Amino acid sequence: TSTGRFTLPSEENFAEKTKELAELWGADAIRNSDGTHLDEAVLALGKKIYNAYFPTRAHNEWITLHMDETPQVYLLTDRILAESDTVDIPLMESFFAEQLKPNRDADPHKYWEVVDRTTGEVVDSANWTLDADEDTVHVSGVAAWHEYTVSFLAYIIWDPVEMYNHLTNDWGDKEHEIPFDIYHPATRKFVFDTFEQWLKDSPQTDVVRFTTFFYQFTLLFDEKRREKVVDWFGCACTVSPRALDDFEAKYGYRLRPEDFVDGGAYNSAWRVPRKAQRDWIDFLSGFVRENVKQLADMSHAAGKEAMMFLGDQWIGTEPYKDGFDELGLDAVVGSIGDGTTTRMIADIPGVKYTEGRFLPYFFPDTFYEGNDPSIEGLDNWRKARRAILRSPISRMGYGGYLSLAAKFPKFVDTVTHIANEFRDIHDRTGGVAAEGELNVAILNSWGKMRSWMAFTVAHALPNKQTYSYYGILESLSGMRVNVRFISFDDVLAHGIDSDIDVIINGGPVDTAFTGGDVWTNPKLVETVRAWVRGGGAFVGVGEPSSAPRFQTGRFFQLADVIGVDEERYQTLSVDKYFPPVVPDHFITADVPVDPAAREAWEQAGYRIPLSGCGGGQSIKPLGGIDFGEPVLNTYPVNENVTLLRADGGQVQLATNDYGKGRGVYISGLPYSAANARLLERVLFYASHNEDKYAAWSSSNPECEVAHFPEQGLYCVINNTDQPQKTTVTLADGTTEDFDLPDSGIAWRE
Amino acid sequence: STGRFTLPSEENFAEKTKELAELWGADAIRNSTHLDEVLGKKIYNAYFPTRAHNEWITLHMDETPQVYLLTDRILAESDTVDIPLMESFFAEQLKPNRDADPHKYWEVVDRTTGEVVDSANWTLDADEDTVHVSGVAAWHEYTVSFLAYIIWDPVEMYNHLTNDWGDKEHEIPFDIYHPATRKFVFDTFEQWLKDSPQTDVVRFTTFFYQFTLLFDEKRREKVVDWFGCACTVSPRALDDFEAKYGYRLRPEDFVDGGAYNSAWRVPRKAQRDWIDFLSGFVRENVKQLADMSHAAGKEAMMFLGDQWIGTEPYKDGFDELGLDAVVGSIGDGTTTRMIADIPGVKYTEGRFLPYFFPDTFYEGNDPSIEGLDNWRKARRAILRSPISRMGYGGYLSLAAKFPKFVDTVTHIANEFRDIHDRTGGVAAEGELNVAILNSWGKMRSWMAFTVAHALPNKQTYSYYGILESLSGMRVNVRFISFDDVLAHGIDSDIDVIINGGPVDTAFTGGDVWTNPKLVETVRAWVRGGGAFVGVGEPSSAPRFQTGRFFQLADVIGVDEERYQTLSVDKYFPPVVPDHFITADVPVDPAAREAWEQAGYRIPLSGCGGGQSIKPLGGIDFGEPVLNTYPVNENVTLLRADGGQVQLATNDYGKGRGVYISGLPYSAANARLLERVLFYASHNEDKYAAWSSSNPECEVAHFPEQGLYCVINNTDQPQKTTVTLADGTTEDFDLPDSGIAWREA
Ligand SMILES: [Mg+2]
């Protein structure tokens, strides 16, 4: 009975149950509760011992004596309306005073900017003063009826992880942990000296679990103690006067506070990055990386592993940028939130192994009397499992309080099953990826550096604005294709790699994800058009290839490829003619049929041509597919485009032949089993690979197949908590029928 | 009570004609062609200046009107590409002008780069309508813009295709810009006048230029703009334009990248220069026709439609033409107002619906229903801006076969005349001064948010609703332009400004909102007590500010998230369900309970909080404006369903801003708008006086006659209580389409 690949949390006064559960779950590693030297009875088990390290917090005794060395962020004030030629702007009224504090030490006139937001102009620094007695900037000689703001440097006085916990589990009047910035040599020396001593003081730790490193991700709170700004990939909170001044020297130009506050966007990953953002990323990453390497080296010299948590103070690491391997990190561990976040961890190059921390975390918010944590446990396993077959992770484990999980025998038995199943998958496949059946490339401004990081604001929390796009990643995360992320820069520099079958471009207009004005670069349009014409496949979602204003008559610059454009109220004089919808088609074959709606749709018919209204639009909606957020007034560019769904006087789903290749338009794609199948059929259809679809496929969309040619195996998995019957089709055209229980898996030669 | 009513007649109908003219109180008759010694009625005869003379135009086919046509986009797959000119167009309507040098008058464009392709890189095929382009970039799209002759008049062509006349000869239109054709038109008209002594009113239907109307190769409408002047060019006109204006127009100044100068486009200098050139010419020639009619003892009357381009009825100087009347088609409230509000003429006439034709006058149908419908929509508007005369078109013989309809017309004509008699034709008292602000201003009064006459659709109805609501509302409506506000500020008599429409249209205004002087003027005015009502995407300007889309977001308390600010949590304050603005919205108790029960979203990372989990509903806002959100928690949200904002109000100094995401016309929505206007202008105390409790009825106060009326806008009985100025109430129970008059 398999053992290993499993990390178990421990805690004091819990020797008996720890060994029972380690035995039961086949743990080869134990996570010592933070701080804490652990029970000898636990240490005698001879498991691999994880101890977490918190390098830039939990030492107020240092940082209270060097408060100008805390991390910093540019903050943007509320917009203040001048009603004459003077205006006063309070600095701190919209922000949380327990987290943030204006920096009055570094000359405001050098480091800050007052902006007239109505004109975009910087106000002369001779026209403003910072009040000596309170956090208010006085501006004079400006225009009445304009809005003004200040961008100012703020010390961060409360570490966001310690803060979030405090506020979330109200730890009352417990001391707030103050973060510290290693960019400053005094602090940096304190950090490495402390780490050296801790290494000496921890002979029994096998793995130093850095949780995490030097810089928080963008996270700001308001005066009502709510989250104000968040970007899980953002490096807002990484500046200081010295860092900014060194940057100017090295790069040959001075950043504006505007290059950080970004009009109030705070350099959201959704914004098309410019040179300033790419340069800062590069400057910050060189410095963070140099220092992570030192930590790894020191860990190794002491005989221990270096393991990074993919979260908390992870900024500047850039796990997907070239050179990550140079750090010599042994492992990355992250939170398993779904398939997309499973891949974000799994696909990381340059480490020896990866580790998933599965849900639920062992805490009272889920482990309370009358709750059934086992359901979520299995759910989480199933969403990660489908992804693990496409890109394996090396290890699994859980976090929190063992003594809490131990009170729920059903949950305990569920983990026993998950752990055995994790090891079975690994042992049968040798930890190798399943065969991908097509090569699919997501194209955006960021490319590989943001692999599995697209369409995200906060970690694993899709919302109204992101779910129609995030669903694309979640579908792909466990799909039987090979997925890579590429950038407009890669494409302009090197063309489109010849192994790629399908390119996906998706998002709203004017985001890093669709690409913005890069679509008015004729070389990009030529490259993609030539490639589609020669048998490439282009799948556009939402507002693909969009560029406002460039052409009065063409919003999606590749409207010709995908057969669809969005009306922008500039072309209303042009009657739009919709060809009849094709309801029977390869792409839609697995969509459940609703005869009541189809009948209502067929009875109601198509709008006859009418002046200023065009014609051809179905009077009633066919429906049957959840397309998410609408893209208003999409329409077919000519009548040779194939409309598959065009309900409510606009287009949701369309396909277009373009020379040898095809274009497909999808207006949006929330994740569901049915939509993942829809997407999957789109990939095969657009690449002219219909004849390749059946090999290693499951007839039922609720199940997936993974083929492992090198070990002579395939499996089939049930992605649901319900029994599923399905017919698997093998490469030679043979089939087998399955009856898969709840969350089950079957393996065959 | 008799008169103010125009009746049509065919031939061979003397007896019944006389009966109906006396039933309806007709004081004028519209003849098709001359008959019966029915001859002391005012006689209307239609005149068609620029068609029905094929004998002339076939001898001068280079003097037909012309238009710039934009071809399909053709993909180049190497350094050469061929572009057929006519494949997307109707060949019986349009023919390429091979007469005027293509290399001087046409343009080939690389649509991928926007660059004009050098004339030396293209040729026009000698034997087919195909342009050969060489020395170009592979994988770009290319188009030609070319001059086309218009060989079929669009009124004759619409009517032809509507009742397939088959081989009936096609009327070819002619352009009076050329001297020979102009001379033919005036001489012919001079002669026609001599021959028509019984004709009292020359009903010009219409003048010299068709509105933008182009058909495709499948015989369908391709491009339409009721206000557009696409079909008004010629090599001579363009050459002359350059002499007068000091620059050469590009064909692109007309085809407009495919938009063809839709009135929805923000007009640039070229569009305005052409309007002015064309208008000068057109008006000069219309004045002559009016002069000629006058020296023959006849009235000159203009049809607001068909060939009306260049007249510009709302532009200053229109009065100088000396036109006695405008007649127009009554489609709805908005189109009624469009006719009624025209200055510079002696009287106005509406042609009411239905037209007397078999498409509605057929066995089994009750056209009185439509008759009353049409009359109710116009009436509410006539109260606010009276029209002089009414009447119908079509075959009287067909309508006469429908005695309930005949009774309905009698009821209508009598009621029309009764309103005139009681009020002396004066406009009802307006209770607020309301200005619509856009790029066009008054030249396009009641013409906003329109493509095809009186045909709102999916893309327009959420904004056309604003006009349809105001058309019959008890307030004074003006239309002003950004140039007006920039040159003169905001008139001291205006209570409320409305800005409405999608981003980057003439109706919101586009980049004018990046002009700080505009922003200064509106903000200062609002702050001192003005009212700003923004509909859809008011004040929007893309890209100008990363964190601000609606430039006056601060005024109205609402902006639209454009995916630049997703990192910023949005906090929605609780909705206020009981409020002056929404007071007449019906409360559906199971809906309200479900909404109260689902509660509000608690704040979650990257998701903000405070949005309702279930919708309150109750109001149809039309097309969604995605991801609108409150700029702060001091804004009052009245409707914020589905994680976005439909209705909100914000105090801004002494004034207020209001946001409405869209407003399809209905009695409820009209009422909503009206309460928004009184609220935004801090005039809640003024709302009661001369109002109807029931949104299905409206009140017109005529203080100079010590008199008000209340009208039933529906075909159903409606109970309502009117409040008067003194705080007094009076009750009514009105029948279908009813009216009631009271001493005041
Ligand atoms: Mg030839």
Map out the domains of chain B as residue ranges.
1-64+171-427, 65-170, 428-688, 689-744
Long-range contacts, A416-421 (Cβ 8 Å, 24+): A416/A24, A416/A25, A418/A358, A418/A377, A418/A378, A418/A381, A419/A6, A419/A25, A419/A26, A420/A1, A420/A2, A420/A26, A421/A381, A421/A385, A421/A745
Is B306 known to be catalytic?
yes
Cα B332 from Cα B378, distance rounded (Å): 6
> What are the C-alpha distances in Å from B559 to residues B237, B616, B646, B663?
46, 21, 11, 18
Is A579 within 8 Å of A641 (Cβ atoms)? yes
User: What is the number of CB-based contacts under 8 A between chain A and chain B?
Assistant: 221
Contacts of A584 (CB under 8 A, 6+ apart): none
Amino acid in the structure at residue A199: L
Per-residue tokens: A541: 């979602």
List the end-to-end C-alpha distance of chain A, in Å, as a whole number.
22
User: What kind of experiment solved this structure?
Assistant: X-ray
**CA-based radius of gyration for chain A:** 28
Cα A86 from Cα A127, distance rounded (Å): 9
Contact B228 A573 (CB under 8 A): yes
What's the CATH code, domain B428-688?
3.40.50.880
Cα A387 from Cα A339, distance rounded (Å): 5
Superfamily of domain B689-744: Golgi alpha-mannosidase II (2.60.40.1180)
Longest dimension (CA), chain B: 87
In terms of CA atoms, which chain B residue is nearest residue A234? Answer: B567
Q: What is the torsional sign of CA B475, B480, B482, B484? A: negative
Contact B566 A629 (CB under 8 A): no
Cα A60 from Cα A72, distance rounded (Å): 17
Say whether residue A464 is in contact with chain B using an 8 A CB cutoff.
yes
Decide the pairing of beta strands B531-536 and B655-660.
Answer: parallel
**CA-based radius of gyration for chain B:** 28
What's the CATH code, domain A71-176?
2.60.40.10
Say whether residue A585 is in contact with chain B using an 8 A CB cutoff.
no
Strands of B442-530, DSSP E: 476-481, 496-501
Q: Estimate to the nearest angstrom the gap between the alpha carbon of A219 and the chain centroid.
A: 16
Q: Per-residue DSSP letters for A706-749?
A: EEEGGGTEEEEEE-SSS-EEEEEEPTTS-EEEEEE-TT-EEEE-
SS3 B497: strand
Q: Is the backbone peptide bond immediately before B112 cis, with ω within 30 degrees of 0? A: no
In terms of CA atoms, which chain A residue is nearest residue B604? Answer: A227
Contact B451 A571 (CB under 8 A): no
Q: Residue B503: its chain A contacts at CB < 8 A?
A: 569
Choose among A266, A572, A649: nearest Cβ to B264.
A572
- Scanning B65-94 for CB atoms below 8 A from A yields 72-73, 75, 77
Decide the pairing of beta strands B201-204 and B299-304.
Answer: parallel
Any idea how long chain A is?
749
Class in CATH terms, A434-694 = alpha beta
Q: Is the backbone peptide bond immediately before B423 cis, with ω within 30 degrees of 0? A: no
Contact B606 A118 (CB under 8 A): no
What's the CATH code, domain B1-64+171-427?
3.20.20.80
Say whether residue B586 is in contact with chain A using an 8 A CB cutoff.
no
Contacts of A301 (CB under 8 A, 6+ apart): none
Is A1-70+177-433 a CATH 3.40.50.1970 domain?
no
Is B453 within 8 Å of B334 (Cβ atoms)? no
Per-residue tokens: A203: 């002979």
Contacts of B703 (CB under 8 A, 6+ apart): B429, B744
Is B498 within 8 Å of B467 (Cβ atoms)? no
Edge to edge, the sheet with strand A724-729 lists A697-698, A724-729, A735-740
Torsion of CA B502, B506, B512, B518, to 10 degrees: -90
Q: Residue A551: its chain B contacts at CB < 8 A?
A: 111, 114, 257
B131 Cα–ligand 1 center, Å: 11
CATH topology agreement for domains A71-176 and A695-749:
yes
Per-residue tokens: A102: 């204006």
Contacts of B710 (CB under 8 A, 6+ apart): B692, B697, B698, B699, B700, B720, B722, B732, B734, B739, B740, B742
Identify from B72, B566, B613 which residue to disrupt to test chain A contact, counting A C-beta atoms within 10 A and taking the largest count.
Answer: B566
Say whether residue A168 is in contact with chain B using an 8 A CB cutoff.
no
Q: How far is A265 from chain B (nearest CA, A)?
A: 5
Is B720 within 8 Å of B728 (Cβ atoms)? no
Alpha helices in B383-452 (DSSP H): 396-399, 403-423
Contact B257 A464 (CB under 8 A): no
Is B594 within 8 Å of B603 (Cβ atoms)? no
**Which residues on neighbouring strands pair with residue A147, listed in sequence order?**
A81
Say whether residue A277 is in contact with chain B using an 8 A CB cutoff.
no
Contacts of B526 (CB under 8 A, 6+ apart): B532, B555, B652, B653, B655, B656, B657
Listed residue (B414, B318, B303) closest to B348, CA to CA: B303
Is B478 within 8 Å of B497 (Cβ atoms)? no
Strands of A256-366, DSSP E: 305-309, 331-335, 353-357
**In a 10 Å sphere around its CB, with 0-12 CB exposed, 13-18 middle and 19+ buried, how is residue B359 labelled?**
exposed
Question: In this structure, what are the phi and psi dihedrals at residue B310, rounded to the nearest 5 degrees?
Answer: 105, -5
Question: In this structure, what are the phi and psi dihedrals at residue A83, rounded to the nearest 5 degrees?
Answer: -115, 10
Say whether residue A550 is in contact with chain B using an 8 A CB cutoff.
yes
Cα A731 from Cα A695, distance rounded (Å): 4
What's the CATH number of domain A695-749, 3.30.420.40, 3.30.450.20, 2.60.40.1180, 3.20.20.70?
2.60.40.1180
Q: How far is A722 from chain B (nearest CA, A)?
A: 29
Please state, as a whole number, how many other Cβ atoms lie within 10 Å of the Cβ of residue A295.
23
Cα B420 from Cα B387, distance rounded (Å): 9
Resolution of this deposited model, Å: 2.1
Please state, as a whole number, how many other Cβ atoms lie within 10 Å of the Cβ of residue A224.
11
Cα B399 from Cα B359, distance rounded (Å): 12
Cα B48 from Cα B57, distance rounded (Å): 14
> What are the C-alpha distances in Å from B162 to residues A606, B215, B240, B356, B518?
19, 14, 38, 16, 48
Amino acid in the structure at residue A539: V
Q: In the CATH scheme, what architecture does the domain B65-170 have? A: Sandwich (2.60)
Cα B155 from Cα B231, distance rounded (Å): 14
